[PDB]
Structure 1
Amino acid sequence: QQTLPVAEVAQNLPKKGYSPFGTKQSSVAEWSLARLDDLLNWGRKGSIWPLTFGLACCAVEMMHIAAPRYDMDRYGVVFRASPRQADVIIVAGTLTNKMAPALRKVYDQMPEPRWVISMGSCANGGGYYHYSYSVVRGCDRIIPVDIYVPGCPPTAEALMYGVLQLQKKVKRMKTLQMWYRK
């Protein structure tokens, strides 16, 4: 476990930079590829489009986030209905066996780079129905989950905090910079 620095330590330290990669690149190609990754991540970070799967009980919070108290399009997030145009999927609610193939199908019909947020306990690990004959214990067993938002349901603040955490993950992803090594 680590802890935040103290006031004087902050005073010594410089600006934390903007691109999470930093600005230590050696050669022209390195420095150039650093910027292009930064632009790409900036695009994919600023504009992110959930699919609004929202099966149950959790869905109500998935709507309150769209509501005008913790506005989410403020951050550049919009609910596109069509999975071909949706970039992110907030799986929320329980995943019953009847639904499992449906979720799988919806997921891979969506084009990548696709990130999944598992909202609520029901999706995270099956939640409160974990020992049930009809529920997928978690949603990790159908799809690759990216961010877990604990809660039952998570308070709207918690959900969109997780969204920002996804934005941070979208910010630090290294595709061009490290293709250069590939």
Structure 2
Amino acid sequence: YTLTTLDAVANWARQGSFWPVTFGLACCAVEMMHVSAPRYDQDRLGIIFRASPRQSDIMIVAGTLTNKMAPVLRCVYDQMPEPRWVISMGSCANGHFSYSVVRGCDRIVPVDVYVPGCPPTSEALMYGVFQLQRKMRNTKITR
């Protein structure tokens, strides 16, 4: 084929222009606020996807998750377009165990990249963003 580059030209443009949705729930929401502030102002730039979520492709679940919040998270992914990617920020979403709070967000929405921490720092979420950027580039290999 030789010109296999056209499949990656769209990918390099996708990872640098991607618009993430702020699903701010609790503590991780403001660590993400510090991220989307003077830190992720170069290639992130995406927000406002509540009005949609037909617009924006990357879903960042940042914060805690209640047993009653389950139909809302499921619907956001359903209202999202076909090239949808998911990022799980925070211990509450990753795995905090309660009877009023669900054990994991994986039961609701399948996640591509998981970001650990309580709360994960400005550098912690940013790295998780670059790992998902690498997954969009079709380079997902076992480390």
Q: Normalized against structure 2, the TM-score is what?
A: 0.90
Superposed counterparts of 1:10-159, under 5 Å: 29=1, 31-32=2-3, 34-68=4-38, 70=39, 72-81=40-49, 82-125=52-95, 128=96, 130=97, 132-159=98-125
- Residues 57 and 66 of structure 1, relative CA distance in 2, 3 Å threshold: same
* 1:105 shift after superposition: 0.5
RMSD of aligned residue pairs (Cα, Å): 1.5
* 1:80 shift after superposition: 3.1
- The answer for unaligned runs of 5 or more in structure 1 is 1-28, 175-182
Q: Deviations over 1:46-103 (max 9, x none)?
A: 11111101111110111000111x2x13024321333111111110112111100110
- The answer for unaligned runs of 5 or more in structure 2 is none
Secondary structure in structure 2 of the residue aligned to 1:67: helix
In structure 2, give the amino acid aligned to 1:98.
K
In structure 2, give the amino acid aligned to 1:157.
E
- The corresponding residue for 1:18 is none
Secondary structure in structure 2 of the residue aligned to 1:172: coil
**CA–CA distance in structure 2, aligned partners of residues 76 and 98 of structure 1:** 30
**CA–CA distance in structure 1, aligned partners of residues 8 and 77 of structure 2:** 27
Larger gyration radius, structure 1 or structure 2? 1
> Deviation above 3 Å: which 4+ runs of structure 1?
none
* 1:173 shift after superposition: 6.0
State the identity as a percent: 71
* 1:107 shift after superposition: 1.1
- The corresponding residue for 2:131 is 165
Q: Does structure 2 retain, via aligned residues, the 8 Å contact 1:49–1:80?
A: no
